[PDB]
Structure 1
Amino acid sequence: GVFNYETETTSVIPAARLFKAFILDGDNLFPKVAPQAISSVENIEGNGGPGTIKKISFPEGFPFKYVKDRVDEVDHTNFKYNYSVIEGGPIGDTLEKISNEIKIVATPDGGSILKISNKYHTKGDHEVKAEQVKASKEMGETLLRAVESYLLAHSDAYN
């Protein structure tokens, strides 16, 4: 069945720039700016659009070694990005996939709001523990803050 987690966070980066950096170029950026959170991102197949498969490796000592994610949909117009964790880490005999969606909305003060949904698709009568969900949120925030600090410090990047 499906368990749906939604949350919102704020960013000081304008929506379009954050979408370009955080969402579209997360592959180069995350391991560069947050090597303590993500060790590497490997493009396995595809050119970044729907169906593209990436292997995200975590630093030694993390609960999970890696996941493979699949890009589902990339909407530049509405700054919406849909992708699924499809293998590795928590995925297996109790969890089929995690379907995620982020929408980035502009705020009048020049910042943005990130609206996030994580949909856990389980197998059988296994439920999703809050510990799994909190972990996802805190890494989300860790990557956002590290990317933020990098976009603030490198003004000529992703304009």
Structure 2
Amino acid sequence: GVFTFEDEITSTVPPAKLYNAMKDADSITPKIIDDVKSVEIVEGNGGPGTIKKLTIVEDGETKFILHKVESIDEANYAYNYSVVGGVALPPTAEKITFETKLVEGPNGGSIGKLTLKYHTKGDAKPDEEELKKGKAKGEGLFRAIEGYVLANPTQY
């Protein structure tokens, strides 16, 4: 089944700058996220349908995760990607979609909506810890992109 969760977030960074840096995640994320070592494009040009392989370390063991770029909408400052392979998918987990959408917020920052869509195998529900871990991951990646902008203001 599909189980959807939405979380409202904030940033001091304006939405145009965050959105630009969200599209730069393949170079930003290995720099800032210690465990993420590299991102390689398997198929595609970076747009919707693109498949990416990420190489990770988790206590000194190299592991791989596979992403699919789902959809990109400047119109709603939106960037959506799915985890389609790797450690985050237990056998009753088929896919996890992470959507980020941004709007202008008070005082020159941004209001974020983070959506987690947890796709399960038929009748199963998401495990409570797996949902927690999935949320933390989506939030961590957002904060990486944001972190990078705050640290490198002249780049966005």
Question: Which TM bucket (shorter chain)?
Answer: 0.7 to 0.9
Q: Are 2:29 and 1:19 aligned?
A: no
How far residue 63 of structure 1 moved from its aligned partner, in angstroms, is: 10
Q: Are 2:53 and 1:61 aligned?
A: no
- For the aligned residue pairs, the C-alpha RMSD in angstroms reads 2.2
Between the aligned partners of 1:150 and 1:9, the Cα distance in structure 2 is: 17
Runs of 4+ in 1 over 6 A off after TM superposition: none
Could you tell me whether the CA contact under 8 Å between 1:64 and 1:89 is conserved in 2?
A: no
Between the aligned partners of 1:139 and 1:121, the Cα distance in structure 2 is: 16
1:1-159 matches, within 5 Å, as 1-21=1-21, 23-36=22-35, 38-61=36-59, 65-91=63-89, 93-158=91-156
Between the aligned partners of 1:63 and 1:104, the Cα distance in structure 2 is: 35
Question: TM-score when scaled to structure 1?
Answer: 0.86
- SS of the equivalent of 2:16 reads helix
Between the aligned partners of 1:68 and 1:61, the Cα distance in structure 2 is: 19
Between the aligned partners of 1:145 and 1:83, the Cα distance in structure 2 is: 16
Relative to structure 2, which stretch is displaced further, 10-19 or 84-93?
84-93
Q: Deviations over 1:38-72 (max 9, x none)?
A: 22211111111111001123222299933211111
**Letter aligned with residue 100 of structure 2:** I
Number of positions where the alignment pairs a residue of Structure 1 with one of Structure 2: 156
Structure 1: unaligned runs, 5 residues or longer:
none
Q: Deviations over 1:59-115 (max 9, x none)?
A: 222999332111111111210122222122233531221122211111131111110
Q: Which has the higher strand share?
A: 2
Identity across the alignment (%): 47
Q: Deviations over 1:105-143 (max 9, x none)?
A: 111311111101111111133221121122122233333
How far residue 147 of structure 1 moved from its aligned partner, in angstroms, is: 3.2
- Note closer, same or farther for the CA distance 1:63–1:115 as it changes in structure 2 (3 Å cut): farther
- Note closer, same or farther for the CA distance 1:99–1:64 as it changes in structure 2 (3 Å cut): farther
Could you tell me whether the CA contact under 8 Å between 1:52 and 1:70 is conserved in 2?
A: yes
- Note closer, same or farther for the CA distance 1:142–1:101 as it changes in structure 2 (3 Å cut): closer
Question: TM-score when scaled to structure 2?
Answer: 0.88
Between the aligned partners of 1:119 and 1:63, the Cα distance in structure 2 is: 28
Q: Which has the higher helix share?
A: 2
